[PDB]
C-alpha cells in the first residue's frame, strides 16, 4: 500500500502551498513547527478536511481515493475518545459491532478482539476500567493502545496518527513507537505527526517529511536529511538532536531559500519522476440504536455521582417541602400556599433541567469521529442518547416529588388528580430538557448555553401567572405568554387542584356571593387569573407542551445534521 | 553572594531525602524529572515552603537566612501574575511603590523603572497593554521580561525562577536565557529549574544540580556531568542531548547512582567546603490607595463584564416597567405589587453571584505579593472591596429604582423612593458579602456558585410570598431569620402597601363589612406577619447590616488563616 500526493495546495491564506511526496509501507513521519501544516497535511491525506479547498490529486497505488476511504482506513486522535467508564473489551466490542459487518457471528468478532489484545499486549488490562474523574484509571500508554485497538478491528492497510507521543512520558512514548514499528513489519502503512522528538524516535523512522509555512523543506529517508542539510551549508555539532537541529534551522538558529534548495535537490527529482510515472450504511438502524443506548446506559450507571446526587437532592427537597407546607388548610392562607408550592415545583423542574446541556456538548468530538468513520447515522445517535439518559432521569424525580408531597400536604385525594400532577411535571421536565438540548447542541462551550437557559427561564417565570396577572398585561405584550412552559404547567396544576375548593369557613360563595370581593372559591381564583374551567382548559396546556417538545427535538436534530464534521 | 545548603531533608514520604550543594554567582540550574524535587528544592531555598517540615540548615555567605529574606530576594513564577489590563510601566510603578521605601521620591523610582526597561529591552513596549481575553496582547517573551522586571526593582542579589522556558517557543526561550546570562555577568546569583532543555541551554549553564526521587544524583559544573556519567559506566552516542541522556539514565538504580555520586570527588569537595563554611515596609494608606487604583484600572480595562451588567439591568428595568405599567388599586394590585417587589429582591440576590470571581481569580497573585511583602491582608481586602464591589452593586439599584418607580406608579413620595433604593442597595451588599465569604480562599468557582444558588433558593421560600410565615411550624419558623430576601421584601411591602386601598367603593379601613375581603394594605401586611410600626421597617435594615459585617469579617478571617505556602 503506497499513498502518493502530487501538487497539494489547500486554501481556506494557504495552509499548504505546494507539496509532493509518496509514502510506502513502513514508519513514515511528518515533522515541523506547530504552524507548519503537518496536522493539516495529515488531515488532507486522511480526508478529514473539506475537499473544496483542496487543489491537487491524491492516489493510492495509482488509484484515486474512493468515497468509502475514510471508513476503511484508520485515524487516531491526539486526545483519546475512549469511554473511561467502560472496559477495554467493551469498547472493542462496540467498535466491532458497529464498524464490522452484521453477518459475522459474535464469536468471530470476539476472536478478532482477542487477537488485537494479544498484539497490543493488553491481555492483563482487558477487563479493567479505562478511568475517569471518579474511577481509577490505567496508564496513558494503555489508553493509547486501546485507542489504536478500536481502529485495527477492521484491519486497515493504512493507519493515521496525530501526535501519538504528546501528553505521554518518554519511556511510554518509546514503547508505543516500538509497538508501531512492530506493526509496520507485518505490512501496514503508518503515517503520523510528531513534535520535537528524541533521537531514538528519529532513528525508528523509515521515511521523513518536513514542513514549515506550508512549504516542503524536505522529503525522503530520515537518515539522508542530515546529509542534505550538511551539503546545503549548515553544520550540526555533536550532542545535538537532528530534529532540534532542523527546527533551529527553520527558526533561524530563509523559508523560500530552503524550499528552492530542496527543489534543486535530487530527492525532488526522483519524487517527481515517480509521481509522473504513477499518474501515467454498513449496519441497520436498530443495531446502531441498540448499541448506542447500551453504551450510554453503561456510562450512566458507571458515573453514579451525577444521577444519584440529583435523586437524593429531589428526595430531600420533597421532604423539606412536605415539612414546610404540611397540612394545607382551607382558609385565607390556603390559596397563597397552594399557588406557591405548585409554582416552586414547576420552576424547580424547569431549572433542574439545565443539566441536559452537558449531554451532547461533552461527547462532540467522539460523535464527529464516529460519524466520519461510519459507525452510525445521526438519527441513531440522537434517539438512542435521548432514550438512554434523558428519559429515566427526568421521569423519576417527578414521580418522587409527587408521591412524597401529595399526601403530606393534603392535596385533592383522588387518583386522577395524582396522575395528572405526575404527568404534567413529567411533560414540563421533558420540554425544558428539549429546550436545553436545542440551545446546546452543536457547541463546545457549556457556559453560554447555561446562561441562555437561565435567562430564558427567568423571563418565562414572569409570565407564569403568579408574579403578574396575565389579564392586566397590555395586548401588545401579552402574546409572549404563549412562549412559557411554566405557564402551562402551573395552569394545569392550579386547574387540577383549586377546582373543588372552598377557602372561606362559614360562607357559601359558590351558591351566591354576599360580598363582591371575597375570593372564597377556587373557581373565582382561577377566573381571576385567566384560566378556563372546562376540561379542555386543562389538556390544551399538555398538547402545547408536547408540541414544544417535538419542535425542540427536531431543531436539535437539524443542528446536529448541518454541523460541520470537518 | 553564595547560597549553601547542607543535609536538606524535607518531609510532609519525603520530597527531599539528603541534599548538599553550594551555588555561586552565575547561571546555576536544577534539572530532573517532574517528580524529582527540583521545584520542591527551589521552594525550600527560596523559603516559599513550611519551615517545620525542613530538617537541615541553609546559609548565605556563612550566615543563616534571616526572616526578611523572602522580601529581599526575588522569585519568578511559572505562570505570569502580571495584570494583563495594565501597561508594563504601570505594573513596574505598582511594584516600586509597594516594595521600595516610601521616603524615596517618585522621580528616583521612575529612574529605576527606566533603567530596568533599558536592561530588559522593553523601551518599545513600555506603554502597550500586556494583553487579556478581550485586549490584544504582547508576546510571551515580553510577558516574562515584565515579570522579571517586577522583581529587579529592589535590586536583588539572589534571583529565583520556576520553569522560565516552559510555555514558550524555542527562540524566545533562548533569548530569555541569554538575557539571564547577561544579567549574571553583573554579579547576581541566579537559580532556576528547567524541563528537558536543548543543548545551547545546557551549555549556557555554569553550575548544575540533578535530582530524582529526592536524591542528589549529581552536583557540580555542567560540563563535568557528561564525564562523570561516562566514568560511571554509561556511554552517550553522538547527536544525543546530554540532558535527555541524563533523563534516560534515570528512567532506565536510583540508590546505585546516589551511592556512585557519594563516592565521587565532587561530593568530597562539596562536603569539605560546607564544613568549612559552617565552622511593614510601607504605611497602610499607601497600600490601600495603590491596591484600589490597580483594581479600578483593571475594572475599567475590562469593560465587558461591568457594562454588560449595567446594560442588562437597564433592559430589565424597561421590561419590568412595560409589563407592570400602571398598577391599579383593585383586586390585582396586591398580586402585581408583591410579585414585582419579590422579583426585584431576588434579582439582586442572584445577580450578586459574580462576587465569587473576585478573590478566587487573583489568589495566586495575592499569595505571591503577600509573601514578598507588598501589602497586608487588611489593605488588600478593604481596597478590593472599595474598588470593585461598591460601585457596581450601587449603580444597578439606582437604575432599577429610577426606571420602575415612576412607570409602575408606586407611592409618589421622596421618602419611599429613597427607602426603596437603600433597601435594594443593602440587599445587594449582603448577598455579595455572603458570596465572598463562601468563595474566599478557594480556586474552584463552580462549587461556590452552586452553594450560593442553593442558599438563595432555600432563602426565597422563607421570603414571604410562596409560604405564609405565620403558618409555618414553630420548630421550623426560626429559619426565617437567616433570609436576606425576607428582610428586603418585608421592607418594600411595608413602604408600599401602608397607604393603599384595593377595593373600589368600600372603606374597610374604617370598618370591614365582610370579614374576608383584604381591602387595605394593613390587612395584607398583618396577614403576612409584618408590623405596622416604623421599627418594623428599619429592623430589617439593621439585620442586613449585621449580616454584612459578619460575612465580611468571616471573609477576612478566611484570608488571614489561608496557607500562603
Amino acid at each position: 500500500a503506497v499513498l502518493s500526493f502530487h501538487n497539494i495546495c489547500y486554501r481556506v491564506k494557504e495552509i499548504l502551498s505546494n507539496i509532493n511526496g509518496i509514502m510506502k509501507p513502513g514508519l513514515n513521519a511528518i515533522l515541523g513547527p506547530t504552524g507548519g501544516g503537518k496536522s493539516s497535511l495529515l488531515d488532507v491525506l486522511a480526508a478529514r478536511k473539506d475537499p473544496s479547498g483542496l487543489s491537487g490529486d491524491v492516489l493510492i497505488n495509482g488509484a484515486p481515493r474512493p468515497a468509502n476511504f475514510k471508513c476503511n482506513s484508520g485515524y487516531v486522535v491526539q486526545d483519546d475518545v475512549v469511554m473511561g467508564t467502560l472496559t477495554v473489551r467493551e469498547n472493542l466490542q462496540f467498535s466491532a459491532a458497529l464498524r464490522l459487518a452484521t453477518t459475522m457471528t459474535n464469536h468471530e468478532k470476539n476472536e478478532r478482539i482477542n487477537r488485537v489484545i494479544q498484539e497490543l499486549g493488553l491481555d492483563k488490562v482487558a477487563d479493567s476500567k479505562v478511568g475517569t474523574q471518579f474511577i481509577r484509571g490505567v496508564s496513558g500508554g494503555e489508553r493509547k493502545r486501546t485507542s489504536i485497538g478500536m481502529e485495527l478491528i477492521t484491519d486497515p492497510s493504512i493507519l493515521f496518527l496525530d501526535e501519538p507521543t504528546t501528553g505521554l512520558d518518554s519511556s511510554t512514548a518509546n514503547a508505543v513507537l516500538l509497538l508501531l514499528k512492530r506493526m509496520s513489519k507485518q505490512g501496514r502503512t503508518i503515517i503520523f505527526s510528531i513534535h520535537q522528538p528524541r533521537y531514538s524516535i528519529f532513528k525508528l523512522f523509515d521515511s521523513l517529511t518536513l514542513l514549515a509555512s506550508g512549504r516542503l523543506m524536505f522529503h525522503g529517508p530520515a537518515q539522508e536529511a542530515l546529509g542534505y542539510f550538511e551539503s546545503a551549508g549548515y553544520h550540526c555539532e555533536a550532542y545535538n538532536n537532528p530534529a532540534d537541529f532542523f527546527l533551529d534551522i527553520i527558526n533561524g538558529d530563509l523559508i523560500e531559500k530552503l524550499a528552492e534548495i530542496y527543489v534543486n535537490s535530487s530527492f525532488y527529482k526522483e519524487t517527481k519522476a515517480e509521481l509522473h510515472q504513477l499518474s501515467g450504511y454498513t449496519t441497520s438502524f436498530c443495531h446502531q440504536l441498540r448499541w448506542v443506548s447500551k453504551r450510554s446506559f453503561k456510562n450512566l450507571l458507571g458515573n453514579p455521582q451525577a444521577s444519584i446526587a440529583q435523586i437524593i437532592v429531589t428526595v430531600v427537597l420533597g421532604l423539606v417541602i412536605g415539612a414546610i407546607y404540611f397540612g394545607l388548610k382551607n382558609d385565607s392562607t390556603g390559596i397563597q400556599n397552594r399557588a406557591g408550592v405548585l409554582f416552586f415545583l414547576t420552576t424547580n423542574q424547569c431549572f433542574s433541567s439545565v443539566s441536559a446541556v452537558e449531554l451532547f456538548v461533552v461527547e462532540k468530538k467522539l460523535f464527529i469521529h464516529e460519524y466520519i468513520s461510519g459507525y452510525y447515522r445521526v438519527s441513531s445517535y440522537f434517539l438512542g442518547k435521548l432514550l438512554s439518559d434523558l428519559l429515566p432521569m427526568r421521569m423519576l424525580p417527578s414521580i418522587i416529588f409527587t408521591c412524597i408531597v401529595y399526601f403530606m400536604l393534603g392535596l385533592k385525594p383522588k387518583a386522577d388528580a395524582f396522575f395528572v400532577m405526575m404527568f404534567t411535571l413529567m411533560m414540563v421536565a421533558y420540554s425544558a430538557s428539549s429546550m436545553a438540548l436545542a440551545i446546546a447542541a452543536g457547541q463546545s462551550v457549556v457556559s453560554v448555553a447555561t446562561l441562555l437557559m437561565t435567562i430564558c427561564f427567568v423571563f418565562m417565570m414572569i409570565f407564569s401567572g403568579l408574579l403578574v396577572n396575565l389579564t392586566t398585561i397590555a395586548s401588545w405584550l401579552s402574546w409572549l405568554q404563549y412562549f412559557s412552559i411554566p405557564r402551562y404547567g402551573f395552569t394545569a396544576l392550579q386547574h387540577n387542584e383549586f377546582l373543588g375548593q372552598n377557602f372561606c369557613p362559614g360562607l357559601n360563595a359558590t351558591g351566591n356571593n354576599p360580598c363582591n370581593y371575597a375570593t372564597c372559591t377556587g373557581e373565582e381564583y382561577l377566573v381571576k387569573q385567566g384560566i378556563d374551567l372546562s376540561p379542555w382548559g386543562l389538556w390544551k396546556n399538555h398538547v402545547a407542551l408536547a408540541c414544544m417538545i417535538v419542535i425542540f427535538l427536531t431543531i436539535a436534530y437539524l443542528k446536529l445534521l448541518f454541523l460541520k464534521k470537518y | 553572594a553564595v547560597l549553601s545548603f547542607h543535609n536538606i531533608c524535607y518531609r510532609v514520604k519525603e520530597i527531599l531525602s539528603n541534599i548538599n550543594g553550594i551555588m555561586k554567582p552565575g547561571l546555576n540550574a536544577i534539572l530532573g524529572p517532574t517528580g524529582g524535587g527540583k521545584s520542591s528544592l527551589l521552594d525550600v531555598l527560596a523559603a516559599r515552603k513550611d519551615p517545620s517540615g525542613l530538617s537541615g540548615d541553609v546559609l548565605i555567605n556563612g550566615a543563616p537566612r534571616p526572616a526578611n529574606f523572602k522580601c529581599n530576594s526575588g522569585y519568578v513564577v511559572q505562570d505570569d501574575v502580571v495584570m494583563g489590563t495594565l501597561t508594563v510601566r504601570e505594573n513596574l510603578q505598582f511594584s516600586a511603590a509597594l516594595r521600595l521605601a516610601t521616603t524615596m521620591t517618585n522621580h528616583e523610582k521612575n529612574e529605576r523603572i527606566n533603567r530596568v526597561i533599558q536592561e530588559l529591552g522593553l523601551d518599545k513596549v513600555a506603554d502597550s497593554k500586556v494583553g487579556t481575553q478581550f485586549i490584544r496582547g504582547v508576546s510571551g517573551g515580553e510577558r516574562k521580561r515584565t515579570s522579571i522586571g517586577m522583581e529587579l526593582i529592589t535590586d536583588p542579589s539572589i534571583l529565583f525562577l520556576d520553569e522560565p522556558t516552559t510555555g514558550l517557543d524555542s527562540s524566545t526561550a533562548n533569548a530569555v536565557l541569554l538575557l539571564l546570562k547577561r544579567m549574571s555577568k553583573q554579579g547576581r546569583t541566579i537559580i532556576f529549574s528547567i524541563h528537558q532543555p536543548r543543548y545551547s541551554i545546557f551549555k549556557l549553564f555554569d553550575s548544575l544540580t540533578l535530582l530524582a526521587s529526592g536524591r542528589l544524583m549529581f552536583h557540580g559544573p555542567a560540563q563535568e556531568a557528561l564525564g562523570y556519567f561516562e566514568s560511571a559506566g554509561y556511554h552517550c552516542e553522538a547527536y544525543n542531548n546530554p540532558a535527555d541522556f541524563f533523563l534516560d539514565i534515570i528512567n532506565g538504580l536510583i540508590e546505585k547512582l546516589a551511592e556512585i555520586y557519594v563516592n565521587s570527588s565532587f561530593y568530597k569537595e562539596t562536603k569539605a567546603e560546607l564544613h568549612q563554611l559552617s565552622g511593614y515596609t510601607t504605611s497602610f494608606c499607601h497600600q490601600l490607595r495603590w491596591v484600589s487604583k490597580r483594581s479600578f484600572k483593571n475594572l475599567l480595562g475590562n469593560p465587558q463584564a461591568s457594562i454588560a451588567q449595567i446594560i442588562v439591568t437597564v433592559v430589565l428595568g424597561l421590561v419590568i416597567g412595560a409589563i407592570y405599567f400602571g398598577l391599579k388599586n383593585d383586586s390585582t394590585g396586591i398580586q402585581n405589587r408583591a410579585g414585582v417587589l419579590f422579583f426585584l429582591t431576588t434579582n439582586q440576590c442572584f445577580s450578586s453571584v459574580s462576587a465569587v470571581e473576585l478573590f478566587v481569580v487573583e489568589k495566586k497573585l495575592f499569595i505571591h505579593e503577600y509573601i514578598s511583602g507588598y501589602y497586608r491582608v487588611s489593605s488588600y481586602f478593604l481596597g478590593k472591596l472599595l474598588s470593585d464591589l461598591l460601585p457596581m452593586r450601587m449603580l444597578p439599584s439606582i437604575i432599577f429604582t429610577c426606571i420602575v418607580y415612576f412607570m409602575l406608579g408606586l407611592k409618589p413620595k421622596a421618602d419611599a423612593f429613597f427607602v426603596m433604593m437603600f433597601t435594594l442597595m443593602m440587599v445587594a451588599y449582603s448577598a455579595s458579602s455572603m458570596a465572598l465569604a463562601i468563595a474566599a480562599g478557594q480556586s474552584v468557582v463552580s462549587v461556590a456558585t452552586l452553594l450560593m444558588t442553593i442558599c438563595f433558593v432555600f432563602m426565597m421560600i422563607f421570603s414571604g410570598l410562596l409560604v405564609n410565615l405565620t403558618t409555618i411550624a414553630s420548630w421550623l419558623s426560626w429559619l426565617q431569620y437567616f433570609s436576606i430576601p425576607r428582610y428586603g421584601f418585608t421592607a418594600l411591602q411595608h413602604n408600599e402597601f401602608l397607604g393603599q386601598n384595593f377595593c373600589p367603593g368600600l372603606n374597610a379601613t374604617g370598618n370591614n363589612p365582610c370579614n374576608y375581603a383584604t381591602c387595605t394594605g394593613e390587612e395584607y401586611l398583618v396577614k403576612q406577619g409584618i408590623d405596622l410600626s416604623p421599627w418594623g421597617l428599619w429592623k430589617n435594615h439593621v439585620a442586613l447590616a449585621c449580616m454584612i459585617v459578619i460575612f465580611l469579617t468571616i471573609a477576612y478571617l478566611k484570608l488571614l488563616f489561608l496557607k500562603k505556602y
Epitope: 351566591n512 378556563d532 | 367603593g505 372603606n507
Partner: antibody, heavy 118, light 107 residues
Framework: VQLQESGPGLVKPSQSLSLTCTVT?????????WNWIRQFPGKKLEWMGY???????TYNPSLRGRISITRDTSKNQFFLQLRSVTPEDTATYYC????????????WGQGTSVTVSS | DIVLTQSPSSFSVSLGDRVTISCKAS??????LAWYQQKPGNAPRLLIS???SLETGFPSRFSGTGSGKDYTLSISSLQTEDVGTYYC?????????FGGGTKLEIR
Amino acid sequence: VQLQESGPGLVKPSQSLSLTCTVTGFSITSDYAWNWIRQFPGKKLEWMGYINFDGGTTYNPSLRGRISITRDTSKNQFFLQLRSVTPEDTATYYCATFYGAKGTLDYWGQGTSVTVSS
Amino acid sequence: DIVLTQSPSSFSVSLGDRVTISCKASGYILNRLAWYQQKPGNAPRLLISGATSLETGFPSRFSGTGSGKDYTLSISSLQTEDVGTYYCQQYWSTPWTFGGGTKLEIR
C-alpha cells in the same frame, strides 16, 4: 342617595362637554363610587367611568383620553368632561352610584339629554 | 372584553302568562349578574343582584337562575305594570357591559 344632573342641553361638534351631578343625603368622599352612564337612542347603555371616594378614577378604554372625571368636596359635586365631541355621542347621560360590597348600581339620576348638532 | 347577549330582543305575551328572559356572556361571570327594569322616560331601576337575590320594592314574582355563562330571568304571572325594557349587567370586570335590551309587549 339623591342625585340630580345638570348641564348644557346642546353642544357644538368637537368642542367639549361638561356636566354636573349634585349629591344630597351623602358625602361623596365617604364610602361609594360615582359613575357616569349614557344611553344612546336606539337604547344601548354604555358605562363611561367612575371616581372613587378617595379621588381615584377609572375610565372605559373605548374613550381614549377624551374623558376626565373630577369632584368638588365642598358642595358634593362630581363632574364630567368629555372633549372632542361628535354627533355620534349624543345621548341621555346619567349619574349613578356603586357600593362595591354588593356590586350593583343602586341609585340613579333622572337623566339629562344632550344634543350634538349644528 | 366581556360582551353580554340577550337573544330575545323582543317578546309578546298576555297577563297571567309566564315569560322567561336569558342573557349569555362571552366569559365566566360567577353570578356577578344584575337585572335592571326600565320604564319609558325613566331611569333604570335595580331588580336583581347576584343572579338570584331580589331587591326590596318588587314582588316575589321575579326570580333569577343561572351558572357560569347562562343566566335567565323568570317573571311568573306577569301583570301590566311589568311591561318594559330589561337589561343584564355584569360587574365582574371593570369595563361593565350591559345587554342590548329585551322589550316586553302585550297581546
